[PDB]
């Protein structure tokens, strides 16, 4: 209601309650702490929309049992078809890696190195058994060609740094920049450097194949560097996983610099904030995050942002005081879902963490100046002749003017709800579908609430359409989005099929 | 396409053609020069939308023959039901008046008066036969109570002015401010003064009754001063002329000062620019005109503006050079129709004058910054729960985005087309009706093109609706507003009746 | 004070008085009706700022006596140095022309031609004595090369039109499009055609030389077609008339099409609306003015607009009712001065016409939405490092905030006042100069009020500056722009010379 | 340079360097870790502007030795008068408190209480020696009157919560809501409750007196609840500390609800984020912070925000990874200085923490859309007649247009620099003063860089002014804000004294 952003901030009140609807999606990692059909059932009630499986750890037998358990808890509530809530399954690839050899043969032995000490790095397979505080063997056979003189090298999550001093054929002579402890099989990161590793490793061709067979909703693709890498993943999923959404993880200088070509090839972005903060300096990661959420909002594409719980540095008191400034930040920046990794996989209090994500996410929607955003998105939209685009703009403007409580949209592929949601209307968008995969992927887009319809297809089509609209109005009242004698916008097509949405009706709630 | 008003003006090109559609209505007065079924037929082709009858002159027998002739020429073209054009009939009341008595008994005698000479004005009926250059008799019996000391009096269209010097009971002693010639039965105007004459004269109760019997489309009400005067006219039309549109003429200081209460009571305003320029000083009439067109645009109510042809003051060349700056001004100010009085009633070249109004009106729509106007009207619109208002805002926004070539609206009373037109969309608004009175009144609102449908009501209602939409698409292509494989917005209701408009479809032209 | 343009129009009141200051300049033509030192003295009091001399008529002896008389009336008021008002002298060239030969030898004989009749046009000098209703001789020797087949020709101010039928070497065979009367020595106009006549005629090289010798303030240059024509005039004025302002008259399709290159070469534009309306169709002249005033406002260059008095076409009443819609239009479009030709040269009531221009000009400044204009001009201004530009922007913004009643500027060439005036501040701009030519040219720019200072240059410079500021504050209070204990902005430089303005002080009026 | 906020975010680049100037102030707490003249000297170089002394701990003898040491390190650099940097001293009151009695007589004994157990709270002084797990003695004698039935009570930083069950005269019977350990002399907090404690305690009347004697720059006032409390502090400082800035700490529901009356009475606000998060729920503190920074920007008053360093909750790696999202947030919200408490008082690496605050603060100024802020502040500014206000608006607008590198302002009280800084110009504001207290307080306002001038007052005043301007231009070039042949705005008055600023000059850098 404010004319300015400064007025808007000045009128924030702490003695007023929020709405029931929570626009932002919640993604939880599943490990040993929460693999069980009783823990799962309880997180679904707390507000979990997506379950992420991390294919770094475990085998294919172990994961298949987590998927089975995720589906069992989901289907428990498929008895009251009004209060059923769909839940997606995603798959994080391990992704292409560079690793050191075994230290002193054993693998449990640790050799400590001091600042200044020059060491040689060798690519020859003789030294892969015995690495000492003078010779390190790396798995990467092309490191010499990608590295330059003056380039830095990080060993094990940026604990040890090496300055490149002398560049030679099949060997590198390096000064030591930081002191730490070298263990066996530790990961290597090469800042600045435009790495030449393949798009998919030999291991991930097997995991991408396992996911298509296990019928997953989306794939998180690690270490994306160019638009050709995204194209590679799409070939491996084949024509049998052609519906599976590819989300590109951005996690080095190069993928940041070449962002615009990746965005175009992908189905959505993830800003892997831990990973990005090893390669990029800490105070620059802050800016790179806002730039990527900004560009994803302007293109109408979903952007996941991977967060953490923080605590105070000086700790005298006993309580943990789980500080969720990190989470609230992203909601405000205009992220579509937020992710919690460790806190839900191996941590001690999983339910408590989902309940925190929820309560923060809900409250922080108050502080956005939604009006400025909404106008702004409508200006950078092109004139077209596509009937569907024009229906959507009509629906969104009607909805301001009558202060409607919901926009109902019938959809098969999800595409018609996606066009409405790119404007960020105030009103919740209910999508009514029969396709069960479409109801799952809908959690990626901010402000869409999917409802799946189970009923048998009626004889007359006009009569089928009127059944799915009514279903949607019951589910709306049950979940408390509007009551009787309110106004809703309803959006549909003229014939059966995908791509024919063209009608907008303004109706009273029965 | 310009961001500013200054850019907009700088990009005007004189080597580019205009569109075929002319948004502004054209009202012509009918007198002896153009009472004939051959002259009438020819003005209808030139672009005449309304025929005005002036009830100052003629009798009731004479006017009834003009109406008959207007209808005959109209119905001549009702053979090709696609190219038929409806034509309204309006009625200008004579309106309440003050007149002087006979000069020197004869009525043809003229007595000239010089500056300074004090004369008496008497209300007593003895002097009504013989008025001299010392005693004038006026018809108004309450002039003494409404006039003050220092008030001016205008005799015969502001030729002679009288300053009030001495105020007495039943007599006025007046200095002479301007010299001229006094004739017999000349009209009196009293600037500043809040006159007490009745709302309708004894003559106009008879004319308002004649018009209801003759089935006229709208009534022009003279000398409106307050919102009670408008209410009086509405009682005389009764409940048998309850559809007849009342347009209030504004023609004195008081009606200007009390504008906002009249606007609310009326169906539209007319800015009688000749009349207003006798009572108000010449350089103030300019401002009073813009203020009233402004307020009528903001309220969503039509405003007629009565204009003239001008010529150059110093005339050496033989051509008349009909200067239409007066006409172009009003189109730009945001008038809905323009009127031409004398040029069409008694003048020598009637067709030429209608062809001029048309050509000016068309061209001057180029110079309006339509974008600034359109945004501006949408901001000063209130949030409601009325389904119809929300349908209309939806239709208008859809129409920008797809660059549609027309908005088709089905209507009975005209009300649904009126709501769309209050936004001033770029696209022409086609109204499809069966009601023949509704198609006539549609000429008052800027940018609506009425089409009347003659076909018999089909059995199934859904099938009736689809017939009137198609009719509208043929008439659209014939008149050349869009071709095949263009996009149109269509706007309709869910059941038969008035007040149920709620649906908006975006369709390809068949 | 309004947020919108529609609110602004709705709040116009007819019961409120205007300010004393009149921003727009008034240019009067001087002929026989007003050549006299008594008529002149009286127009100077009425509000005449510039006296135009038309070098079509009269000789060099006759004009030199008008100039002498203009200066005598001016200097009459140079006794009270506070109430003195400076007055410019301008010079309208006759400009390059094409004329027909003598009809039937006599020159007073007239031959009438009917529609259809083919006539030959010959360039050979044998027929220049005897022109008949079959053979016309034209002065232009290159007409054959500039004209095309299908091109039209206008003879004597567009009375007769000729369609080109057959094109031959040294002869033209032409159909007759309009019928009229051919006289002797009538002017020829060639629409569309990119004419090849020289920039200055042999006569105007003599008049431009006479004006430099007579010390005129500005030259009006007729029939400008390209940026090379303007350069030609500048060479003829030499280096002795290098201060004289060149105003380019625009009066054909070509000068309109090539506008942007002329504007850059000129000191200001004149939109000769009579002349432009012979060559261009009547309803297009409307747009072409408007485009040119718009571009002149954006470039910060003055634009004169030449107007007329109009009267009603159907005239039954005795009063002339001098209709000044033409004049009010231009003030609103954003013209800097307005001109009146015939009404002041040969007409019967010269004083009455100057008093009309004044009263209209003053009143019509009420209806401009000055806020939208002002913001708009500030956005399309480039970042520079010029101290003077930054001083000016500072002065104008300070002046809003304190609601100052005047901006005082010391100037030698006029350039520092010109930079302030390009923003169109609300407050009057007083320019204080010693240069008498600078005080004269200041009437071209909208909103500058020049004051000339006659006092002897004081010894200490700082003390000189403080004398000219005070002079300016007396003249301001006398003319009633502000009273004692008001606030003014004062603008000056750090050293003597041109080009050093850099200081802005906010002072209380003493 | 962007038209929108969404464009602005999309154009953020991570391969571009920041400016040298850091707009936001840095406040450090001084304890045992950094009381030494060698540690102090080193933090001054790192970017410390204010040294805070916490009057909870220590005696008056101990603090007087910290002040002495702060001044010694400051004055070390007063040898090169160009590179000297002034440093303020502030004083945080302990503030009014409620405390429990001794547990079981000893004071080191702890009694643990379980959920459910009803305990009595007694105000009678018999039980103040022996408190058990049934009877607690509180210092507050009016708790019964301020508390209601259903009100909660927090004991020792919200470890234990008590629900009020039964309300009686001089006793409270309370359910236990949370279990913990009760110690001796633990602080009590009463949410919702409009507490009646005095404005200043008996201890703080002594500390406020010590600070006036020790010549401190500003006083931080704890537990402000109403505009009368601020008035009380102002009386105790007397008329000998009338220049000392009062900053009101906001730290309960009441002070938040009554914010607008406090702001008006104060010299600036501090948002004590730790303290506020005990009384208010965690997810509401987030909003209350943005509301208060918003209101302080709109009123032109400085707002300090007290922050912390955070670390990741799940910690497997060895590095601390000092997460400064908390700090970056506040800079973006539009805080004027940021504070670090523990990290600098008792922590192990003080220098490292100041270097972190600096590096974050600098970088996060990149992401603000400074243009939208700047326009926004100029719209909500009132028209006045104050010369100084108009000079300031002039200076700020000039400065955009010429892209100046600095605004130099001469000031005695600081007031003229404060008016410029309330607009938030892009260019740094250098304030040149002789008053040493004025140079210290200047660190509170965002974007002002004070320079103190030590030279002797010259004879001619005009010549004094020209010396202080030049000093300011040397100091500007040394610190690298502009080089030779750049442009600066300079702002000064017409006579000596406070309150006469009226002149603005645009000068080239010598």
Swiss-Prot record, chains A, B, C, D:
Variant or mutagenesis effect after changing residue 412 to E: Abolished interaction with phosphorylated CTNNB1. Impaired phosphorylation of histone H3
Residues where L-serine binds: 49, 85, 443
Main enzyme class: transferase
Protein's recorded name: Pyruvate kinase PKM
PANTHER family: PYRUVATE KINASE
Renumbered residue ranges of the record's region Interaction with POU5F1: 286-510
Post-translational modification remark: ISGylated. Under hypoxia, hydroxylated by EGLN3.
Positions where Phosphotyrosine occurs in the chain: 84, 127, 154
Quaternary structure, from the entry: (Microbial infection) Binding to certain oncoproteins such as HPV-16 E7 oncoprotein promotes homodimerization.
Region ranges (Intersubunit contact): 368-412
Record's miscellaneous remark: There are 4 isozymes of pyruvate kinase in mammals (L, R, M1, M2) encoded by 2 different genes: PKLR and PKM. The L and R isozymes are generated from the PKLR by differential splicing of RNA; the M1 and M2 forms are produced from the PKM gene by differential splicing. L type is major isozyme in the liver, R is found in red cells, M1 is the main form in muscle, heart and brain, and M2 is found in early fetal tissues as well as in most cancer cells.
Pfam family, one: PK_C
Record-listed Mg(2+) binding positions: 251, 275
GO molecular-function terms, A-Z: ATP binding; cadherin binding; histone H3T11 kinase activity; magnesium ion binding; MHC class II protein complex binding; mRNA binding; potassium ion binding; protein homodimerization activity
Residues bound to beta-D-fructose 1,6-bisphosphate: 411-416, 461, 468, 495-500
